[PDB]
Symmetry: D2
């Protein structure tokens, strides 16, 4: 018998004896993702083309409005907004949601996969809600995941008891559980990084990559993939195995990717799946942010591949 | 004042005073692509999961029957079939069609962008049709193109007059012309290749990659992108500029990509767009096929990038 | 801000301090209705027509499977099944659901509106669950309503605190609250009955109809409508006002419509909206069934119109 | 071996050796109908309800612009426009098109079936086009038909060769031929009329209705059906058999239905189907229009039922 996201979430909220506030939040998210999927796939485009009678701004406006209306949130952090958004008291809940409404927006004109990333924290210090409420390490996440708008739309939800994948059936607007309790392969055979920045890579990265192309024990070199859209690259890593890297380089001395809404949610997802997520020096989830738009270096994926790189880092220290 | 693919195809048939046979064919293609797009985005998956108690194969069958139903074809060549398909004389038209119904199928499980590639030839001769009718150099193509099932579904159609892009509106099931008489940039800033095969590259490719990461004239390095699905990588090249490469290596000294249904269609779109498509030695479109599943090395993209690499190929001549 | 059925149901379950069992049931129903809507609209019909690679049986199979999987039901009564269906102990809940999966199936070949009708009872006598558990008067309903597959799909849900209408947006597969706390007009101007049975009508009905065509006080006669699909006819009555009638006649000495899954749910809906629902002699909801497939006469709609007919009945008694 | 409307229309244009102008027109119609169908079923309604912070009018604009974009028309007559629309000479074709973009609009709020009706004429003359070009008797129609937005969406197209029915597959946006060369039953068992106007009927109609409820030869009475939307009532008549009537009464001694865009198209479909369409005195198709919004009484359906009523009309002659 089939399991829909709505049923699964509700069930999980029942086993946890929640008051149903988080459950409403997750149902709001799902509704928002479906709406974003529909806009991404271009339904109604004929209307802009005058059969007479933006995508990231709309996406932002959908997430914020849909999340507010859930009455389960108090603080919102968007990649798109400079300051955190404080929900009006009438609509307040106890949750802080950190999200990237549409990641990979550059890739839009090229029709490359894009996705939505979100991390959910529970408000701790019960003072008037504010930005500080979002400044929590990723180890403190209640839930995190992402929606990938690729050849099909998928929602990956990670919580304390594991990672689950839900495929969207757009005929009936419902997410079906298709992969339960996901676990990443211990060792993979694909490395993903933008080698265009080779000139700026630190030594450890340089050695690792070359070890991938020319393995000492003449084994098969790793295949390479780099879609340029984090959600797509990280999703392939989780599903097929391997390692994804967006280390520090001159243009981004602290990495390009943001900690709260890109790095943390993906780090959380990887850990629950049995993978590692490091900065090179430390675990991503343990870092305590000081700025909501803070950036951080990130390397994640199969435990053996990440460990192997971490050993190399240590060797140059 | 909107243009649908159906309107466009018909006006073009009228301008060229065709009997309407090629128009029937293009319309059958449009229908097949819409049907594939729907299965790719998983409409109906709830039924496989028991809500009421392959893909490569399904795509092949759709294209074949829809093409036969057009009464415009005599010989069909598919990546999925060992032997060419000779059409029943009852439905025999004059066109030969070579296609890859679902390219990048190994990416399906990862939900990476995938697509359909086709090239159409007019039968040249007057004897019983056979495989031999498909063995024409790409320069003899009447039409060629592809459909990309990415964040949105797109059909790119190349004919003698040029290249046009049609975006699928899944709400009304109509391809809408969105980019007219497309021309690739003279020079791009992205290079695309599986650097996992570094150990195997010939000296010319190696030197080029090097120039891209460490520019000898102190110009900015190129960014790297490699989705792993030709239609996705090529479509990004066409729209954004740059170069895509899949040269020879232990993976056949002859390349991996197939000439008839992958290389030729793309080479044809590139040339009509004002770009180049070469094997490093000769232009892809001039190669005389000798086997329907013949492979060939290919390099395509912005003219200045392709000429640059060709120069290196010559330096090592 | 928008209100989706999922949010509304959850919210209502929260205010009622339910354990979330009914909430899951209602979410199961909604999922089933969306799936039935999609099949009714004919998505995928191209596949039966061989682009190479029942509606009431499928509908039945969807409702039963989806309801079972909710783990909130113990007894199921379908217009389509001879005996009540007892859910396996592992999947048991405390609810008894009486439904017509696809009412108006004759009207299918003519593409006339069809709908789904359901009534929900709470199991009372805690003995092993059985048919007897369904034999409860309609006054004992916890929830009832219907889905109408007309020009657009709508779900009308009635519960103790009122009647609400939700319109299905098939782009995102979500029901949006479009009409809150529905109340029927006190007096209408449309009568709905199949006058083809005039030869068999009892005297009261005969007098009423003629009073509608030739009003004593020369006022405007009532307009007449009779779609032949109860859900459509009753839905127009609720929304626009008037009276619907399916009285007893020779072919159906006790009416055609069934009490448990057609009459009761519609009677419940009408009462909460401020309308009346009578057999001519008694209120529909007060009747205690003795057979699950029992039939009953029914007259419902605006309070003044129904009262006016009831007066006439009394006059001939 | 499936037939889409697009394939059918093209083969028919080829058999008739047309220049492709009428084919472009029919294809533009197919596109408009699909666009209307989508708005009717409310795709996108969530946006009107603020998810991210008319119908008659929208339908008119769609048909008009899509028709003008076809370059096959010179004069357009709409139920919604006081004066006929003369096409800009730049896009002027040779066809005159009369249509009701959304018939039964008063039923919209009740979600009752609704539809689009069109009749196409070839311009006969050689002077500046004008309203006068549309004033042709229905016997001069090149094509006529309708689309019904009911439980499923259907397009019925009538041309010289006969009547065909195409079911819309909303998953791929394609009309699929499902009923070929349709013929109405010689005699039906359903009569359709608004009996609310009994007081106003002429003696002949009154006598007929009477014969249907109380058959003088002791045969079974006819059942009654009256949806209240012409396209719905007529489509049921065509498929199931019977008679539909909207005769004269205080609601204009001249009938309610409009000749050019409601009566003629339907009369034309009926005749091609082997049925009859009369005003009681003369055949609808032979009436010489004298005003574009001229109304006319109509009776259509199975030949034996229409002849029967015509006989009564004569008895009172
Ligand atoms: N649907 C759910 N899925 C998983 N955990 C849940 C769910 N609902 C509530 N919980 C857990 O219970 C806590 C409080 O729930 P709540 O009362 O809804 O705010 C949450 O923070 C989670 O720890
Ligand atoms: N829709 C079309 N678009 C562009 N060229 C066409 C079209 N139809 C026919 N032609 C051209 O005219 C030739 C013969 O058309 P046909 O008679 O249909 O086989 C083709 O092979 C093309 O070169
Ligand atoms: N979603 C809901 N909407 C309205 N009433 C509810 C809801 N959930 C529960 N209730 C009410 O509370 C009772 C018990 O709920 P439950 O524990 O879920 O079985 C039901 O029978 C209703 O009376
Ligand atoms: N697709 C078509 N189906 C049936 N008849 C057509 C079609 N196209 C053209 N014809 C017929 O041929 C005439 C002229 O076609 P046209 O040149 O397109 O204006 C029409 O008016 C019809 O009588
Ligand atoms: O367009 P965004 O939202 O800023 O995302 C781009 C990000 O950019 C990374 C790739 O950037 P580079 O071009 O530097 O490789 C991805 O991995 C992220 O999706
Ligand atoms: O033959 P397939 O399974 O359709 O593979 C697709 C091709 O595979 C190439 C990638 O091959 P590598 O893994 O060797 O890079 C892509 O460009 C082409 O799309
Ligand atoms: O086809 P069903 O499920 O038995 O429903 C038909 C019912 O039949 C009534 C009309 O029947 P008559 O033909 O006797 O008028 C409707 O009001 C109900 O929808
Ligand atoms: O003019 P409209 O609003 O499009 O009305 C539709 C017409 O209205 C007739 C019903 O009229 P009565 O209420 O007079 O029966 C139907 O057959 C026709 O569809
Ligand atoms: Mn963003
Ligand atoms: Mn981002
Ligand atoms: Mn393939
Ligand atoms: Mn391939
Ligand atoms: Mn039924
Ligand atoms: Mn029924
Ligand atoms: Mn109208
Ligand atoms: Mn009208």
């Amino acid at each position: 018998n089939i399991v829909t996201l709505t049923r699964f979430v509700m069930e999980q909220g029942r086993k946890a004896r929640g008051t149903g506030e988080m459950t409403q939040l997750l149902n709001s998210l799902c509704t928002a993702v479906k709406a974003i999927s529909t806009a991404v796939r271009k339904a109604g485009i004929a209307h802009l083309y005058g059969i007479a009678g933006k995508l990231d701004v709309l996406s932002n406006d959908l997430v914020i409005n849909v999340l507010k209306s859930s009455f389960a949130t108090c603080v919102l952090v968007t990649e798109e907004d400079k300051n955190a958004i404080i929900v009006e008291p009438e609509k307040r809940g106890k949750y802080v949601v950190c999200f990237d409404p549409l990641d990979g927006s550059s890739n839009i004109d090229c029709l490359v996969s894009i996705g939505t990333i979100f991390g959910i924290y529970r408000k701790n210090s019960t003072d008037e809600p504010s930005e500080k409420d979002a400044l929590q390490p990723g180890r403190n996440l209640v839930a995190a995941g992402y929606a990938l708008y690729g050849s099909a739309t998928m929602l990956v939800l990670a919580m304390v008891n594991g990672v689950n994948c839900f495929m969207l059936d757009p005929a009936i607007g419902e997410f079906i559980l298709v992969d339960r309790n996901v676990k990443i392969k211990k060792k993979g055979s694909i490395y993903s990084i933008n080698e265009g920045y080779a000139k700026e890579f630190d030594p450890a990265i340089t050695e690792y990559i070359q070890r991938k192309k020319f393995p000492p024990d003449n084994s098969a070199p790793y295949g390479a993939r780099y879609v340029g859209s984090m959600v797509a690259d990280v999703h392939r890593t989780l599903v097929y195995g391997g390692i994804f890297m967006y280390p520090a380089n001159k243009k981004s001395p602290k990495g390009k990717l943001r900690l709260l809404y890109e790095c943390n949610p993906m780090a959380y997802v990887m850990e629950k799946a049995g993978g590692l997520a490091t900065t090179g020096k430390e675990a991503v989830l343990d870092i305590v942010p000081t700025d909501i738009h803070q950036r951080a270096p990130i390397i994640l994926g199969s435990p053996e591949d990440v460990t192997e790189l971490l050993e190399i880092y240590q060797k140059h220290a």
